[PDB]
């Protein structure tokens, strides 16, 4: 009732009861900020509960031993944890945090560590080092949270207390329970009450950018923030997705038993497969009916084009023929004292036998009720756990089967009984016909690939420059430049003039460790490489890209899994545990380098690559004699890669969490971060499955059944793989489902294939399907809600965090994550309003003034927040499928514009100038009184702006830019082409575009992109603050030129479209008549049924469409020059900025004029883009078939388009599509009401907009 007193008007401003004004939204933001933590928990203690939320909590969570017996010291002076239950037991325990703290100066009962511990640790006191490791890793574990958790809870309160919500589709209130039924809120405030106790403060910790502070009660445990995070996660996901209370009680029981354990995160990692194993992996024992999709993976087996054949009724022969799930699941439930929850899940999973919305909803609930923490541990523990592994090659290649070496590499005899002959043959032939194509010999392609490894968090530039210092070369330091020391562009810039034989030693330096965290998985560790070894690692990824695009051509999404899980078909989920610890030089890289050395060896005789010259080695390969034969540049690069992959890798290790533990060591794992990582892994998966299916199958079985199976199951028809995961497609025959026992014999044979030469196929045959962690049952997608947690944020470094203008953007990301999964929309959108207004005000500390930084709602409405009830309209009036920009802005404003004008003449703001859009009513007074314009223009202000700003010395930057351009060049023929194009441009194309995209702004653009990690603090932040203030005080005239050009267009809707799919089929989980709006859009519009990498790659007008400079700007500028007159030589000059060869560039610039482009092409002209929400739906259907001109009234002479400049047709389709779809209900077809000016004057206005950039 307290929040009711401060939010009298606001809580029904956003529940569809009273009209949403701006002033109450800012009053709400005032009450949001002017607020504290005791008010949080007295609001929590205010509410009662209704005897289903309550559960007993054991007091054994709290009283805990000390961490003195938990860590120890390595012989090489490294702090290391002592294990207790397995080698996985290495994490943070929930123990003994009270006595490692000094209370804060101006606070009473909170604070931080005492510093003299860290004085002794910098002196080398062992217990002090153990103490500061434990304190800072608990700091890191509590660091993983975006915002104060209390404000998330208060957003729950202010959203939830509005009560029941009417549905305009179902004409009912909802039937979800309210506050008085959740175990997370009651148990959450119970934990906080008992931990704080009778002490005057209440919040057990406070989040802060400078770092978390703890409360000093003696019962405080260290792993209380992830428990509180899981509580607030389930607290949201009940009332925003309609979970039943029972499974939430199950999930919080798991979380409380986790916090009661020895260590929290270890139990979380070992517990993560209870909800899938007992619900998903045991579902549909004996069905009776339902409706499944009917798809067809078409005849081109790489098209990813699907024709949906329609619904299909089920039958009882489609029961679960997958094997049993009793033994291992009940052993897992017994092992961790959790037999009760497993018994309940295996009870209720049996009770469902109909493939409808209810069963798939229950599976969605089971997926959602797992935990969502981020597993945080010490970096030394990672790099001494997973980087200390070697594969189990039980049958290696015998030493008699290799030839005499050629340089460093022996060659396989082809009369070899080992399996690796087939791998040798594949990479041999692939290297041969890779070097046979002249597309590898484009020097522009050379420049692309040299620019390609300028990405992916380049590091170790320090170790590059001191290894380069060790190998005795002069060195430009480039004094007085801001970011550059931590940049890979400096790594490239230092070796822009250097011979290859003078740099071949410098590929032996070590490697930095970049860390990330994951949902329910061990923390991955990306690593870069320095630029010469990324440069010399090229033909490896050349042939890998050759395999993945030509030879096995498997893949680089959703109805892939819909086809795989479809009931007569059967899927097998195949992973590997720890791929990168398996690719070593023992069995793979020797054969890989031999085959890539010899496959090019026919085509390579005297060819040079960029940078590298030729050489010569000898051979024992003609073992009767010995000679020496010359070595080409491909073979030179392979000869240099040979010793690097043969040798092993050195990894520097330095953390911020343990005090000064630096070390390097040898590790034989292929790096996770490289250009050649994922493509090579896919190629190896495909080749091993090919060798399996070719020879190793019928060599090792008996019955005709499994061999008669696998004869018809080749990799070109049934196998897809991307790195970790692989997937079987088992085709259902005329008898329906394939017999299961053959498939189990086959999969234990695949497990044998894994164990016998250094693999471990995690094989999961379950009657369902996963692919890129996307779950599919009977052709129905499961939105996993664990892997998009609201509260958590991965911060593997203790580096201080960016201030307020971007946490709001991650709130927008939380909103879109909630959009892309099937969440209850009445209660998701209102909670999003609550969070959105909760992070509005800021309370700066600028000089001489207490400034308040206030966004209106209208910036968010520009960013795609669906309005509930505006200007006295009906509540819940349109959907969240609005394109987040001027398009969607236009869409919903033009849906309601006459009702707007009636609200305008109410509280009369009248001026006799009859506007074409609002008539007698004005707009300038009211829309500034409502500050529609203020938020609307504040939305386009750039956020978190860091700038160089220091006026660096220009000569040293100029020689830096020249060295960068020298790195950009290997052939001056490129320079000849682009300078010739510059001459052509300065003749013709210059002027009328005001901004040519070129290739020599690209050194300037590389510098500008390199200068965006200075994280400077004061001056540009103050400039952004005063920029917002002078944007706020400035009164505005009218809208954007795009939007004013759009507001002359009207439309007319009638005849809702015929249905696309059958509604009685569960398409996705969480969408139904109960979740009325997005399900009804899915039924009306239809799902996409494409990969969309292929479709949107068809959109990009350049063929290879990569340059390193956002090729969308290239194609958009080309089409702008196309529509704005501009004779052909100017178009060639714009393309000669890229400078292909000028002959085919002249040909492409001749082509672009007369060819009518796709509808999606002309979006980039007007800077339109398809928003992210639409690719679940099939959009191209309703573009090219339903939104149309020449309406059913007929022709109008205002609904006309001139014969030239028919590029408008695409944009009319876009705007009509937006207006047809942003409203709730069926995506009705939409017809053109007139445009008030004629197509000539309208397109002339667009010409006048594109006169500038």
């Amino acid at each position: 009732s307290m929040i009711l007193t401060q939010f009298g008007p606001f809580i029904e401003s956003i529940s569809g009861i009273t009209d949403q004004s701006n002033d109450v939204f800012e009053n709400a933001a005032k009450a949001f900020s002017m607020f504290t933590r005791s008010d949080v928990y007295k609001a929590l203690d205010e509410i009662p509960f209704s005897e289903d939320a309550m559960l007993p909590i054991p007091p054994t969570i709290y009283t805990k031993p000390s961490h003195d017996s938990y860590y120890y010291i390595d012989a090489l002076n490294r702090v290391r944890r002592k294990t207790y239950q397995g080698p996985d037991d290495v994490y943070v325990p929930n123990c003994s945090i009270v006595e490692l703290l000094e209370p804060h100066e101006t606070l009473t009962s909170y604070g931080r560590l005492s510093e003299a511990i860290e004085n002794r640790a910098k002196d080398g006191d062992s217990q002090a080092r153990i103490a500061t490791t434990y304190g800072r890793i608990a700091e890191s574990q509590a660091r993983q949270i975006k915002a104060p958790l209390e404000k998330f809870v208060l957003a729950l309160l202010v959203a939830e207390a509005g009560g029941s919500l009417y549905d305009p589709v179902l004409q009912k209130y909802d039937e979800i329970p309210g506050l008085s039924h959740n175990c997370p809120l009651w148990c959450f405030r119970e934990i906080c009450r008992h931990i704080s106790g009778p002490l005057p403060d209440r919040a057990p910790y406070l989040y802060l950018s400078a770092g978390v502070f703890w409360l000093m009660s003696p019962r405080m445990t260290s792993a209380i923030p992830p428990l509180l995070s899981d509580l607030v996660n389930l607290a949201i996901l009940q009332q925003t997705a309609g979970l039943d209370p029972s499974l939430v009680r199950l999930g919080v029981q798991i979380c409380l038993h986790a916090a009661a354990s020895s260590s929290y995160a270890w139990f979380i990692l070992k517990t993560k497969s209870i909800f899938p194993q007992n619900t998903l992996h045991s579902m549909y024992e004996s069905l009776e009916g339902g409706y499944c999709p009917n798809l067809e993976w078409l005849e081109p087996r790489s098209d990813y084009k699907f024709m949906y054949m329609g619904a299909m009724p089920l039958s009882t022969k489609y029961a679960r023929s997958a094997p049993s799930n009793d033994k291992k699941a009940r052993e897992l439930g017994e092992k961790y004292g959790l037999s009760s929850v497993v018994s309940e899940l295996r009870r209720r999973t049996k009770t469902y036998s109909k493939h409808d919305f209810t069963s798939v909803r229950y599976i969605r609930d089971a997926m959602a009720c797992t935990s969502g923490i981020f597993l945080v541990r010490t970096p030394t523990e990672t790099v001494l756990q997973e980087y200390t592994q070697s594969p189990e090659i039980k049958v290696p290649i015998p030493q008699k089967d290799w030839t005499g070496p050629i340089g460093e590499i022996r060659i396989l005899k082809d009369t070899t009984s080992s399996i690796a002959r087939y791998l040798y043959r594949t990479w041999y032939l692939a290297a041969a016909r890779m070097a046979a194509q002249p597309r590898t010999w484009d020097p522009l392609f050379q420049a692309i690939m040299r620019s390609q490894y300028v990405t992916a968090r380049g590091g170790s530039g320090a170790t590059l420059r001191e290894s380069l210092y060790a190998i005795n070369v002069s060195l430009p330091d480039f004094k007085g430049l801001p970011v550059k020391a931590a940049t890979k562009i400096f790594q490239a810039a230092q070796l822009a003039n250097l011979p290859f034989s003078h740099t071949s030693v410098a590929i032996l330096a070590d490697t930095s460790m970049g860390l990330r965290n994951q949902v329910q998985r061990r923390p991955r560790s990306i690593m870069p490489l320095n630029v010469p070894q990324q440069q010399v690692s090229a033909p490896h990824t050349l042939t890998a890209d050759y395999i993945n695009y030509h030879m096995n051509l498997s893949t680089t999404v959703i109805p892939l899994g819909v086809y795989a899980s479809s009931p007569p078909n059967q899927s097998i989920n195949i992973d590997i545990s720890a791929c990168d610890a398996s690719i070593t030089w023992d069995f793979f890289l020797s054969v890989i380098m031999a085959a890539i050395h010899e496959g090019v060896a026919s085509s390579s005789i005297g060819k040079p690559f960029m940078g590298v010259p030729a050489s010569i080695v000898n051979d024992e390969s003609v073992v009767g004699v010995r000679a020496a034969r010359p070595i080409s540049g491909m073979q030179n690069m392979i000869q240099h890669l040979s010793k690097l992959y043969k040798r092993g890798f050195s990894y520097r290790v330095n953390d911020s969490f343990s005090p000064g533990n630096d070390f390097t060591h040898m590790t034989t794992t292929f790096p996770s971060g490289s250009t050649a990582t994922s493509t090579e892994h896919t190629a190896n998966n495909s080749t091993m499955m090919e060798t399996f299916l070719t020879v190793w199958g019928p060599e090792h079985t008996d019955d005709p059944d499994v061999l008669r199976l696998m004869k018809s199951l080749t990799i070109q028809r049934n196998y897809v793989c991307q790195g970790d995961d692989g997937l079987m497609i088992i085709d259902g025959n005329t008898a329906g489902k394939v017999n299961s026992e053959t498939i189990q014999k086959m999969l234990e044979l695949i497990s044998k294939y894994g164990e016998e030469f250094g693999w471990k196929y995690d094989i999961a045959y379950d009657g369902t399907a996963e692919y890129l962690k996307l779950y599919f049952i009977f052709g129905c997608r499961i939105p996993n809600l664990s892997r998009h947690p609201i509260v958590g944020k991965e911060r593997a470094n203790s580096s201080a965090e960016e201030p307020w203008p971007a946490i709001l953007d991650q709130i927008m990301g939380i909103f879109f994550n909630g959009v892309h999964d099937g969440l209850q929309w009445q209660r998701w959108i209102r909670y999003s309003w609550a969070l959105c207004c909760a992070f509005s005000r800021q309370r700066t500390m600028t000089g001489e003034s207490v400034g308040y930084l206030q966004y209106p709602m209208w910036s968010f409405v520009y960013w795609g927040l669906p309005l509930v009830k505006v200007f006295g309209s009906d509540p819940w009036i349109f959907s969240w499928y609005m394109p987040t920009g001027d398009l969607g802005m236009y869409s919903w404003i033009s849906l309601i514009r006459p009702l707007m004008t009636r609200w305008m003449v109410a509280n009369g703001y009248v001026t006799d100038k009859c506007s074409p859009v609002f008539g007698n009513a004005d707009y300038r007074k009211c829309f500034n009184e409502l500050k529609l314009y203020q938020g609307y223009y504040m939305a386009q202000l750039p956020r978190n702006p860091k700038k160089s700003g220091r006026a660096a010395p220009r000569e040293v930057r100029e020689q830096f830019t020249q060295a960068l351009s020298d790195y950009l060049m290997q052939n001056p023929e490129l320079k000849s082409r682009v300078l010739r194009g510059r001459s052509e441009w300065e003749k013709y194309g210059a002027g009328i575009i005001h901004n040519p995209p070129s290739l020599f702004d690209v050194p300037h653009k590389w510098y500008q992109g390199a200068q965006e990690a200075a994280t400077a603090t004061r001056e540009e932040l103050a400039e952004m603050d005063e920029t917002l203030m002078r944007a706020r005080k400035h009164s505005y005239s009218s809208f954007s030129k795009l939007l004013e050009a759009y507001l002359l267009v009207k439309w007319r809707m009638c005849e809702a479209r015929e249905p696309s799919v059958d509604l009685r089929l569960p398409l996705c989980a969480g969408i139904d008549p109960l979740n009325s709006d997005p399900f009804l859009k899915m039924v009306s519009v239809g799902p996409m049924l494409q990969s969309t990498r292929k479709y949107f790659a068809q959109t990009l007008f350049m063929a290879k469409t990569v340059s390193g400079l956002d090729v969308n700007a290239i194609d958009s500028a080309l089409l702008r020059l196309r529509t704005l007159g501009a004779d052909k030589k100017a178009l060639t000059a714009q393309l000669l900025m890229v400078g292909l060869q000028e002959s085919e560039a002249d040909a492409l610039a001749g082509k672009i004029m007369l060819q009518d482009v796709n509808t999606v092409q002309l979006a980039r002209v007007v800077n339109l883009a398809v928003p992210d929400t639409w690719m679940s739906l099939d959009f191209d259907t309703m573009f090219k078939h339903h939104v149309k001109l020449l309406p059913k009234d007929g022709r109008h002479l205002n609904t006309d388009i001139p014969p030239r400049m028919g590029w408008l047709r695409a944009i009319l389709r876009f705007l009509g599509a937006g207006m047809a779809m942003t409203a709730t209900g069926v995506a009705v077809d939409i017809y053109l009401e007139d445009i008030h000016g004629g197509g000539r004057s309208l397109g002339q206005r667009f010409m006048t907009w594109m006169r500038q950039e």
């Binding site: 589709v169 179902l170 004409q171 009912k172 039937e175 039943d244 409808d356 919305f357 209810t358 909803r361 229950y362 509604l1063 139904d1072 008549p1073 109960l1074 009325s1076």
Partner: protein
Amino acid sequence: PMSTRIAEATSAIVSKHPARVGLPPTASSGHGYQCHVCSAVLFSPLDLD
């Protein structure tokens, strides 16, 4: 329970009543009862609206 909730959801959205038994359609028994401006009969759920 969720199953009865989805049952009432589907019956609310789809299973509305008039299945249109085949009569000779009469003036004093029509689906459009009174078209509120023109005051007549129109027989059909999309016609009256």
